[PDB]
């Protein structure tokens, strides 16, 4: 109970030791000047488990977090929070491999869904925002702009089942605005969509 | 241990009682002439649990089977095996609602996948065989003939993303043979496919 069993260089916790915390946490790893630095394992009382780098009593560098619910993070940390390039395996099978800033997907990364769908592009605030490509499980592909996990802006949808390529505007994950359908017989249709429904042909 | 605690009409297990079996099973329900008939609950030693009808020491009629792995069957039984109209909830979320013959899907039924896809049609030997409709999660729809869970024969595929309707031959779940693509601009393409790939246009 808030004890320490390790080396005591110059009367300060330095080297390698074990520390049990008042809230129930336990740390076993390297120490400098009473700080948690180097490498070590922290066992949370809630069942979470961390193994990786430490700087100034905080996760800094590469480390892994084994969560209770089954998730696992493998990546870099800054000031005790997910930060930088890291991989996160979700409970059901989904996996994100990309950049993080302050414990949220921000930057370029890819999500491998357990359904077979694969996204890779730019993330802003834990959601798809900006340019990205979604490779659907059926072979369909969307490449274009995203806003808050919705196909939003202009993108190109190519259908694997019949080869038809849509090129035009999207709003809230649906075809909306000016666009063109190009079929495999060379013919190109121009039209106006409203919430994914073609309503006007030119 | 192979005891009996129930009514004993005319020196035979009749009425309602409890029977513990030598392999570990336990039955609690109605009895006629030493037989398990009427209704009752059988607790298997492996953790399986049955509640429903019984005729002549066997599941006959409607009853439910709570499996260990998480599955659950709700339907009719004949001679201790799944038989007739019944519903089966799979571990991950999938559910079959249809006909069974000898513990296997045989007849007309529908499977509600946890992915959102819904099939409904004829089943032969636990697989799709014959006419059936597959309503995909993306809005796509296939209606045609199936062989061993594969689109096989002639069917009609309609694509929700661009409206293109394919009508032609399928072999081993892929477009193969004579077929026609009908686009939303009225134009109809005739061609020959090879394993889902259009290779010849007429
Ligand atoms: Zn299509």
Author numbering:
A (entry chain A), B (entry chain A): 148 to 349
Text lifted from the article:
All three structures are antiparallel dimers joined via their C-termini, and, when possessed of the correct key residues, can adopt extended or V-shaped quaternary structures. The crystal structures confirmed that each 23-amino acid MORN repeat is composed of a β-hairpin followed by a 6-residue loop that connects to the next MORN repeat.
TbMORN1(7–15) P21, C2 and TgMORN1(7–15) crystallised with one dimer in the asymmetric unit, while PfMORN1(7–15) crystallised with one subunit in the asymmetric unit and the functional dimer was formed via crystallographic symmetry axis. Unlike the extended dimers of TbMORN1(7–15) and TgMORN1(7–15), the V-shaped PfMORN1(7–15) is mainly stabilised by a single Zn2+ ion incorporated into the core of its dimer interface, spanning over 665 Å2. The Cys306 and Asp309 residues from each subunit tetrahedrally coordinate the Zn2+ at expected distances (2.32 Å for Zn2+-S and 1.94 Å for Zn2+-O). Although Asp residues 303 (TbMORN1), 308 (TgMORN1), and 309 (PfMORN1) are conserved in all the three proteins, the coordination of a Zn2+ ion clearly demands the presence of both cysteine and aspartate residues. The SAXS analysis of PfMORN1(7–15) indicated an extended structure in solution however, similar to that seen for TbMORN1(7–15) and TgMORN1(7–15) and different from the V-shaped form observed in the crystal lattice. This supports the prediction that TgMORN1 and PfMORN1 are capable of adopting two different conformations.
